[PDB]
């Protein structure tokens, strides 16, 4: 169960989610791909959470300050919903 999610995450291409979120903040090509990728974790709360957490992990070094960090987190919490998916009820994104 926990190992099965480990393997699904190694197989995932969540870079379009990063791009969709960064271009969404700058103001789709990447949303269609990102949502298909997030769909692999739909209705699996622990694994959807870990995916969102790994997106935060990958983006921690590339954000320029706390305020940019909080704006990115906000947009990330809305990404499952904007894909027609359920977010996890609880998921710590403080990396």
């Amino acid at each position: 169960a926990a190992r099965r999610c480990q393997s699904q995450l190694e197989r995932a291409n969540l870079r379009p989610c990063e791009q969709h979120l960064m271009q969404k903040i700058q103001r789709s090509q990447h949303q269609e791909r990102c949502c298909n990728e997030l769909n692999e974790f739909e209705n699996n709360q622990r694994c959807m959470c870990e995916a969102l957490q790994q997106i935060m992990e990958n983006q921690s070094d590339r954000l320029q300050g706390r305020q940019q960090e909080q704006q990115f987190k906000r947009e990330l919490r809305n990404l499952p919903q904007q894909c027609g998916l359920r977010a996890p009820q609880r998921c710590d994104l403080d990396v």
Binding site: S7, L9, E10, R11, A12, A51, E57
Partner: peptide, 14 residues
């Protein structure tokens, strides 16, 4: 022939 270790641990998409 080189042996090489991944930077990122297992389970990461990146």
């Amino acid at each position: 022939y080189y042996c090489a270790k991944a930077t990122a641990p297992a389970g990461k998409y990146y």
